Amino acid sequence: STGSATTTPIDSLDDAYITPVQIGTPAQTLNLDFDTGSSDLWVFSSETTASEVDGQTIYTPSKSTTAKLLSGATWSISYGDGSSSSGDVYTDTVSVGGLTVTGQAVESAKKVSSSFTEDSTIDGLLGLAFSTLNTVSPTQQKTFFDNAKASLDSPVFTADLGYHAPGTYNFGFIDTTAYTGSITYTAVSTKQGFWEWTSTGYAVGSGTFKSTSIDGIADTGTTLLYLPATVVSAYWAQVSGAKSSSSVGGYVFPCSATLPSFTFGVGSARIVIPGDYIDFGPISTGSSSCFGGIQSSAGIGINIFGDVALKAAFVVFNGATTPTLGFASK
Ligand SMILES: NCc1ccc(C(F)(F)F)cc1
Ligand SMILES: NCc1ccc(C(F)(F)F)cc1
């Protein structure tokens, strides 16, 4: 079997992408943030503290004939940005673009942090990292991808994120019409539960390519590109007037500047991120200082190839017994 669903940016900056997901019987459609950096499927629900819900569509297990409470199970998650949520666990039928999984763990939020309440467009998250990171206690639960793997034509899913435009998540097949050239595959380490890989180097604009190993994770759930301080300083040095601002919390640049592209290596292949992808607009309404899409990972502890990088490529998440990541230009 296969599945295919359109994913849409939530705002004019591509801060995140939402994908409709059908839960329960009859279907309740929620717009979830597909996150290859986490492994919990959790949703705003009828159980969420009323004051913490602001416009989100909620899952109501009591209206689903296939929902079953998972007795005694709880979940609690904290994301690298400081967001957090927690609650209890149901099992229900979950469908993504024609692909159906029965008995999927659906984690019902009882409490959500403020950053989730204020994001009216995101009804929850669908984790696509490895199931070792799932937070359900005392019995760990499998991701949607792990549960679908056996019945998929091929144990893969692909992320084709658009720049200021809709894109596609495909499960179980690789659309050979969606990319140009060849797909370059690279080894993945699952030791931390992430889609972790090693980039072979970088270049700034039309500059010389620097061969150097950058270990990082492919994370559809992170907006920006977080890279080591040496690399990030080399990039922003090519932008007149750019500086790191402690009050803003990152590199900013004059909104009148033109940004150079950024190239990253995948084996012997190169993925080019156009400079416009790195512009995230004024730091406040009406400001002439703009926020940069490439930032330092020094405070984080790990390098993150977020949406800024991933949306420049067609990306294959190969969940075979030896997992790999594929990158192609598009
Ligand atoms: N998108 C999920 C996510 C968020 C943060 C991190 C961090 F900070 F731990 F790297 C990993 C994964
Ligand atoms: N990396 C996971 C993640 C995804 C979205 C959000 C937001 F946008 F809701 F804050 C936080 C954390």
Tab-separated table of C-alpha atoms and ligand atoms in Angstrom:
chain	number	residue	atom	x	y	z
A	1	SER	CA	0.000	0.000	0.000
A	2	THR	CA	0.967	3.671	-0.360
A	3	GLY	CA	-0.112	7.094	0.834
A	4	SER	CA	0.234	10.637	-0.463
A	5	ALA	CA	-0.732	13.905	1.234
A	6	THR	CA	-0.248	17.600	0.494
A	7	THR	CA	1.600	19.664	3.085
A	8	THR	CA	1.061	23.420	3.299
A	9	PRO	CA	3.064	26.202	4.989
A	10	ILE	CA	1.223	27.730	7.936
A	11	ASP	CA	2.306	31.312	7.200
A	12	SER	CA	4.153	33.515	4.717
A	13	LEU	CA	7.570	32.576	6.157
A	14	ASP	CA	7.291	28.761	5.983
A	15	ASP	CA	7.641	28.633	9.773
A	16	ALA	CA	6.049	25.168	9.735
A	17	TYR	CA	4.048	22.854	7.487
A	18	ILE	CA	0.696	21.203	8.215
A	19	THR	CA	-0.707	18.032	6.620
A	20	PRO	CA	-4.315	16.818	7.030
A	21	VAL	CA	-4.651	13.530	8.929
A	22	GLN	CA	-7.817	11.478	9.477
A	23	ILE	CA	-8.288	10.066	12.990
A	24	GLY	CA	-11.087	7.854	14.272
A	25	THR	CA	-14.385	6.524	12.942
A	26	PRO	CA	-16.010	8.452	11.482
A	27	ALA	CA	-12.968	10.450	10.395
A	28	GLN	CA	-11.981	13.535	12.360
A	29	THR	CA	-9.572	15.526	10.191
A	30	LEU	CA	-6.796	17.385	12.013
A	31	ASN	CA	-3.889	19.337	10.521
A	32	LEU	CA	-0.685	17.924	11.995
A	33	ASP	CA	2.955	19.022	11.885
A	34	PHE	CA	4.958	16.103	10.461
A	35	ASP	CA	8.128	16.027	12.559
A	36	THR	CA	11.081	13.785	11.657
A	37	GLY	CA	12.772	15.018	14.852
A	38	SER	CA	10.338	13.412	17.317
A	39	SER	CA	8.395	10.194	17.707
A	40	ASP	CA	5.060	11.042	19.368
A	41	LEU	CA	1.719	11.469	17.611
A	42	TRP	CA	-0.120	13.902	19.867
A	43	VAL	CA	-3.187	16.067	19.304
A	44	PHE	CA	-5.252	18.797	20.853
A	45	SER	CA	-8.326	17.027	22.200
A	46	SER	CA	-11.544	17.407	24.172
A	47	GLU	CA	-9.328	16.604	27.190
A	48	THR	CA	-7.044	19.626	26.729
A	49	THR	CA	-7.321	22.312	29.419
A	50	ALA	CA	-9.885	24.700	27.967
A	51	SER	CA	-7.805	27.835	28.588
A	52	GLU	CA	-4.944	26.296	26.569
A	53	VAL	CA	-6.949	25.895	23.324
A	54	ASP	CA	-7.208	28.874	20.923
A	55	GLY	CA	-8.755	27.959	17.568
A	56	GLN	CA	-7.262	24.482	17.134
A	57	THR	CA	-9.381	21.606	15.862
A	58	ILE	CA	-9.687	19.034	18.654
A	59	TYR	CA	-9.824	15.251	18.572
A	60	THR	CA	-12.818	13.883	20.520
A	61	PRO	CA	-12.224	10.203	21.360
A	62	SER	CA	-15.758	9.830	22.744
A	63	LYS	CA	-17.131	10.373	19.209
A	64	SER	CA	-14.921	7.686	17.607
A	65	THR	CA	-16.292	4.137	17.534
A	66	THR	CA	-12.748	2.724	17.179
A	67	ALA	CA	-11.021	4.708	19.945
A	68	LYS	CA	-9.817	2.687	22.943
A	69	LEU	CA	-8.244	4.178	26.052
A	70	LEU	CA	-4.789	2.699	26.675
A	71	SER	CA	-5.202	1.994	30.374
A	72	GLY	CA	-2.559	3.545	32.622
A	73	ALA	CA	-0.488	5.014	29.783
A	74	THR	CA	0.775	8.596	29.974
A	75	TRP	CA	3.095	10.723	27.862
A	76	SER	CA	5.190	13.830	28.443
A	77	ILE	CA	7.443	15.534	25.915
A	78	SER	CA	9.796	18.523	25.839
A	79	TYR	CA	11.126	19.842	22.540
A	80	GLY	CA	14.515	21.429	21.945
A	81	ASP	CA	12.902	24.875	21.720
A	82	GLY	CA	11.465	24.557	25.236
A	83	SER	CA	7.923	23.642	24.197
A	84	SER	CA	6.191	20.818	26.050
A	85	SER	CA	2.936	18.873	26.308
A	86	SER	CA	1.519	15.849	28.129
A	87	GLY	CA	-1.603	13.752	28.625
A	88	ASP	CA	-3.012	10.253	28.182
A	89	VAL	CA	-3.121	7.778	25.318
A	90	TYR	CA	-5.780	6.301	23.059
A	91	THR	CA	-5.472	3.844	20.222
A	92	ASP	CA	-7.493	4.594	17.101
A	93	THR	CA	-7.458	4.338	13.322
A	94	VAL	CA	-5.208	6.909	11.633
A	95	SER	CA	-5.080	7.577	7.890
A	96	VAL	CA	-2.682	9.760	5.896
A	97	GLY	CA	-3.545	10.373	2.251
A	98	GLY	CA	-5.134	6.964	1.697
A	99	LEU	CA	-2.755	4.984	3.948
A	100	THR	CA	-4.507	3.486	6.981
A	101	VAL	CA	-3.058	2.149	10.253
A	102	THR	CA	-5.316	0.547	12.854
A	103	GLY	CA	-4.434	0.651	16.527
A	104	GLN	CA	-2.154	3.673	16.258
A	105	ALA	CA	-1.273	5.299	19.570
A	106	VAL	CA	-2.967	8.720	19.581
A	107	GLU	CA	-1.647	10.812	22.462
A	108	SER	CA	-4.325	13.150	23.802
A	109	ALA	CA	-2.935	16.378	25.242
A	110	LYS	CA	-4.228	17.400	28.651
A	111	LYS	CA	-1.680	20.224	29.000
A	112	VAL	CA	0.170	22.144	26.272
A	113	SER	CA	2.768	24.892	26.512
A	114	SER	CA	1.988	28.449	25.452
A	115	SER	CA	3.825	28.176	22.122
A	116	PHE	CA	1.321	25.520	21.033
A	117	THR	CA	-1.742	27.441	22.253
A	118	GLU	CA	-0.708	30.526	20.270
A	119	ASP	CA	-0.259	28.492	17.027
A	120	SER	CA	-3.905	28.213	15.957
A	121	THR	CA	-2.962	26.471	12.685
A	122	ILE	CA	-1.273	23.372	14.186
A	123	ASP	CA	-3.603	20.772	15.738
A	124	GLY	CA	-0.788	18.474	16.841
A	125	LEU	CA	2.366	16.687	15.776
A	126	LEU	CA	3.024	13.450	13.907
A	127	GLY	CA	6.443	12.104	14.851
A	128	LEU	CA	8.571	10.366	12.228
A	129	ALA	CA	11.875	9.793	14.037
A	130	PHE	CA	12.640	6.314	15.356
A	131	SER	CA	10.295	4.703	17.864
A	132	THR	CA	13.010	4.573	20.540
A	133	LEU	CA	12.255	8.266	21.261
A	134	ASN	CA	8.534	7.786	21.939
A	135	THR	CA	7.585	9.081	25.388
A	136	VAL	CA	4.609	6.842	26.249
A	137	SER	CA	5.003	5.219	29.679
A	138	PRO	CA	5.128	2.488	30.925
A	139	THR	CA	4.713	0.838	27.487
A	140	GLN	CA	6.559	2.561	24.630
A	141	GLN	CA	4.530	3.020	21.436
A	142	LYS	CA	5.405	2.858	17.742
A	143	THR	CA	5.249	5.745	15.277
A	144	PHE	CA	2.788	5.905	12.392
A	145	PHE	CA	5.631	5.032	10.010
A	146	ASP	CA	6.773	1.998	12.013
A	147	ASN	CA	3.199	0.685	12.193
A	148	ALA	CA	2.701	1.141	8.435
A	149	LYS	CA	6.093	-0.263	7.390
A	150	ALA	CA	5.089	-3.885	6.794
A	151	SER	CA	2.179	-3.033	4.479
A	152	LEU	CA	4.003	-0.329	2.511
A	153	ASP	CA	5.175	-1.237	-0.978
A	154	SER	CA	8.612	0.066	0.066
A	155	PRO	CA	9.614	0.982	3.646
A	156	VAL	CA	10.213	4.637	2.735
A	157	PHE	CA	8.642	8.030	2.998
A	158	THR	CA	9.661	11.156	1.136
A	159	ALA	CA	9.490	14.838	2.040
A	160	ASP	CA	9.044	17.368	-0.788
A	161	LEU	CA	8.586	20.702	1.002
A	162	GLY	CA	7.705	23.791	-1.004
A	163	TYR	CA	9.182	27.276	-0.795
A	164	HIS	CA	6.193	29.541	-0.015
A	165	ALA	CA	4.072	26.859	-1.680
A	166	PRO	CA	2.455	23.471	-0.972
A	167	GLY	CA	4.428	20.250	-1.073
A	168	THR	CA	4.008	16.508	-0.657
A	169	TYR	CA	4.649	13.726	1.845
A	170	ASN	CA	4.606	10.305	0.155
A	171	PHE	CA	4.594	6.966	2.004
A	172	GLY	CA	5.708	3.711	0.411
A	173	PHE	CA	6.968	4.834	-3.004
A	174	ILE	CA	9.418	7.260	-4.607
A	175	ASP	CA	7.954	9.646	-7.202
A	176	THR	CA	10.628	9.714	-9.901
A	177	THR	CA	8.926	12.733	-11.512
A	178	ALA	CA	9.452	14.942	-8.436
A	179	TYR	CA	13.233	15.455	-8.659
A	180	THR	CA	15.983	16.070	-11.201
A	181	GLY	CA	19.114	14.007	-11.702
A	182	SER	CA	19.881	11.159	-9.316
A	183	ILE	CA	19.220	10.532	-5.635
A	184	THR	CA	22.386	10.378	-3.512
A	185	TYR	CA	22.041	8.109	-0.489
A	186	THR	CA	24.071	8.511	2.687
A	187	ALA	CA	24.393	6.470	5.864
A	188	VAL	CA	22.187	7.100	8.905
A	189	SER	CA	23.006	6.552	12.573
A	190	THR	CA	19.986	5.670	14.717
A	191	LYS	CA	22.004	5.657	17.945
A	192	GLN	CA	20.287	8.809	19.242
A	193	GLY	CA	16.923	7.940	17.668
A	194	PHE	CA	17.191	10.648	14.992
A	195	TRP	CA	17.665	10.579	11.242
A	196	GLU	CA	21.318	11.448	11.862
A	197	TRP	CA	23.804	11.679	8.999
A	198	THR	CA	27.074	13.357	8.020
A	199	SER	CA	27.286	16.147	5.455
A	200	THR	CA	30.540	16.287	3.513
A	201	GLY	CA	31.015	20.064	3.543
A	202	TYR	CA	29.683	23.414	2.416
A	203	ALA	CA	30.179	26.498	0.263
A	204	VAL	CA	29.001	30.107	0.578
A	205	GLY	CA	27.662	31.680	-2.601
A	206	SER	CA	30.030	30.991	-5.486
A	207	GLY	CA	32.949	30.344	-3.131
A	208	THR	CA	35.182	27.307	-2.880
A	209	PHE	CA	33.623	24.156	-1.442
A	210	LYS	CA	35.088	23.311	1.971
A	211	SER	CA	35.343	19.563	2.589
A	212	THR	CA	34.585	18.913	6.261
A	213	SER	CA	32.329	16.484	8.112
A	214	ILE	CA	29.184	18.029	9.614
A	215	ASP	CA	27.117	15.587	11.671
A	216	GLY	CA	23.475	16.582	12.005
A	217	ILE	CA	19.865	15.469	11.885
A	218	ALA	CA	17.264	15.794	9.135
A	219	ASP	CA	14.367	17.449	10.975
A	220	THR	CA	11.184	18.504	9.166
A	221	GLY	CA	9.956	19.855	12.518
A	222	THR	CA	12.615	22.578	12.853
A	223	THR	CA	12.257	25.762	10.815
A	224	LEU	CA	15.846	26.935	10.373
A	225	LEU	CA	19.300	25.562	9.562
A	226	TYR	CA	21.503	25.254	12.663
A	227	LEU	CA	25.189	24.694	11.935
A	228	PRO	CA	28.543	25.017	13.770
A	229	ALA	CA	29.673	28.510	14.694
A	230	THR	CA	32.626	28.428	12.272
A	231	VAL	CA	30.367	27.670	9.294
A	232	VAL	CA	27.706	30.202	10.291
A	233	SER	CA	30.294	32.950	10.767
A	234	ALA	CA	31.734	32.209	7.314
A	235	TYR	CA	28.283	32.617	5.756
A	236	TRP	CA	27.228	35.857	7.432
A	237	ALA	CA	30.629	37.451	6.830
A	238	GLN	CA	29.576	37.645	3.165
A	239	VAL	CA	26.501	39.790	3.972
A	240	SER	CA	27.226	43.494	4.404
A	241	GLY	CA	26.035	44.734	7.791
A	242	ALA	CA	25.095	41.319	9.194
A	243	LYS	CA	25.873	40.688	12.855
A	244	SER	CA	24.984	38.369	15.695
A	245	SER	CA	22.522	40.099	18.028
A	246	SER	CA	22.234	38.857	21.605
A	247	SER	CA	18.988	40.772	22.192
A	248	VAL	CA	17.415	39.167	19.122
A	249	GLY	CA	19.078	35.790	19.684
A	250	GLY	CA	20.830	35.218	16.387
A	251	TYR	CA	22.277	36.694	13.242
A	252	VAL	CA	20.339	39.589	11.724
A	253	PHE	CA	21.017	41.469	8.513
A	254	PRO	CA	19.822	44.661	6.797
A	255	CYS	CA	16.584	43.871	4.989
A	256	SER	CA	17.975	45.676	1.908
A	257	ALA	CA	20.797	43.135	1.520
A	258	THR	CA	20.844	40.312	-1.025
A	259	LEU	CA	21.707	36.975	0.471
A	260	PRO	CA	24.187	34.508	-1.028
A	261	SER	CA	23.234	30.907	-1.543
A	262	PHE	CA	24.427	28.110	0.747
A	263	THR	CA	25.584	24.732	-0.571
A	264	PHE	CA	25.844	21.576	1.528
A	265	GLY	CA	27.424	18.274	0.555
A	266	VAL	CA	25.786	14.855	0.402
A	267	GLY	CA	28.488	12.361	-0.440
A	268	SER	CA	29.870	13.683	-3.721
A	269	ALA	CA	26.653	15.561	-4.581
A	270	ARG	CA	25.718	19.158	-3.738
A	271	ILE	CA	22.409	20.675	-2.602
A	272	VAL	CA	22.140	24.438	-3.186
A	273	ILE	CA	19.904	26.521	-0.906
A	274	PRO	CA	18.964	29.761	-2.731
A	275	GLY	CA	19.671	32.939	-0.800
A	276	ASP	CA	15.990	33.913	-0.708
A	277	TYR	CA	15.290	30.766	1.359
A	278	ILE	CA	17.488	32.229	4.117
A	279	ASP	CA	15.477	35.473	4.523
A	280	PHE	CA	12.989	35.244	7.387
A	281	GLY	CA	11.863	38.858	7.269
A	282	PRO	CA	11.847	41.740	9.738
A	283	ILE	CA	12.519	40.920	13.396
A	284	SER	CA	9.490	43.073	14.313
A	285	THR	CA	6.765	44.695	12.229
A	286	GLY	CA	8.187	47.672	10.369
A	287	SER	CA	11.819	46.943	11.247
A	288	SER	CA	14.569	47.213	8.648
A	289	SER	CA	16.553	44.445	10.391
A	290	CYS	CA	15.770	40.972	9.064
A	291	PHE	CA	16.259	37.584	10.717
A	292	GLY	CA	18.588	35.011	9.165
A	293	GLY	CA	17.641	31.433	8.334
A	294	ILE	CA	21.113	30.049	9.114
A	295	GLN	CA	21.981	30.157	12.820
A	296	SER	CA	24.576	28.705	15.173
A	297	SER	CA	24.050	25.300	16.782
A	298	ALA	CA	26.515	26.088	19.584
A	299	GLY	CA	23.807	26.499	22.214
A	300	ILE	CA	21.899	23.416	21.016
A	301	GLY	CA	24.422	20.568	21.098
A	302	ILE	CA	23.570	19.110	17.684
A	303	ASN	CA	23.443	20.368	14.105
A	304	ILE	CA	19.963	20.532	12.579
A	305	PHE	CA	19.128	20.399	8.872
A	306	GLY	CA	15.692	21.959	9.248
A	307	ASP	CA	13.118	23.098	6.718
A	308	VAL	CA	15.420	25.786	5.272
A	309	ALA	CA	17.741	23.046	4.018
A	310	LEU	CA	15.249	20.231	3.400
A	311	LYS	CA	12.893	22.295	1.234
A	312	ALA	CA	15.727	22.830	-1.263
A	313	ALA	CA	15.789	19.059	-1.942
A	314	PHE	CA	13.705	15.965	-2.539
A	315	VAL	CA	14.441	13.894	0.573
A	316	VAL	CA	14.032	10.120	0.950
A	317	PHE	CA	13.718	8.655	4.444
A	318	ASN	CA	14.582	4.992	3.809
A	319	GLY	CA	13.401	2.947	6.780
A	320	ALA	CA	14.909	-0.335	5.612
A	321	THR	CA	16.677	-2.524	8.173
A	322	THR	CA	19.818	-0.506	7.426
A	323	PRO	CA	18.293	2.996	7.214
A	324	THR	CA	19.578	5.627	4.796
A	325	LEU	CA	18.762	9.182	3.721
A	326	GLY	CA	18.477	10.163	0.053
A	327	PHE	CA	18.866	13.695	-1.300
A	328	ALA	CA	18.115	14.909	-4.816
A	329	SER	CA	17.910	18.317	-6.441
A	330	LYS	CA	14.498	19.456	-7.653
B	1	LIG	N1	11.855	18.622	15.641
B	1	LIG	C1	11.947	17.911	16.898
B	1	LIG	C2	13.259	18.237	17.606
B	1	LIG	C3	13.420	19.447	18.262
B	1	LIG	C4	14.617	19.728	18.904
B	1	LIG	C5	15.646	18.801	18.886
B	1	LIG	C6	16.974	19.072	19.587
B	1	LIG	F1	17.028	20.356	20.047
B	1	LIG	F2	17.085	18.211	20.641
B	1	LIG	F3	17.996	18.851	18.711
B	1	LIG	C7	15.480	17.594	18.231
B	1	LIG	C8	14.288	17.313	17.589
B	2	LIG	N1	10.301	20.756	16.663
B	2	LIG	C1	8.976	20.342	17.085
B	2	LIG	C2	8.128	21.601	17.184
B	2	LIG	C3	7.255	21.925	16.161
B	2	LIG	C4	6.495	23.077	16.249
B	2	LIG	C5	6.616	23.896	17.357
B	2	LIG	C6	5.780	25.167	17.443
B	2	LIG	F1	5.835	25.802	16.234
B	2	LIG	F2	4.486	24.846	17.735
B	2	LIG	F3	6.289	25.979	18.415
B	2	LIG	C7	7.496	23.577	18.378
B	2	LIG	C8	8.255	22.425	18.289
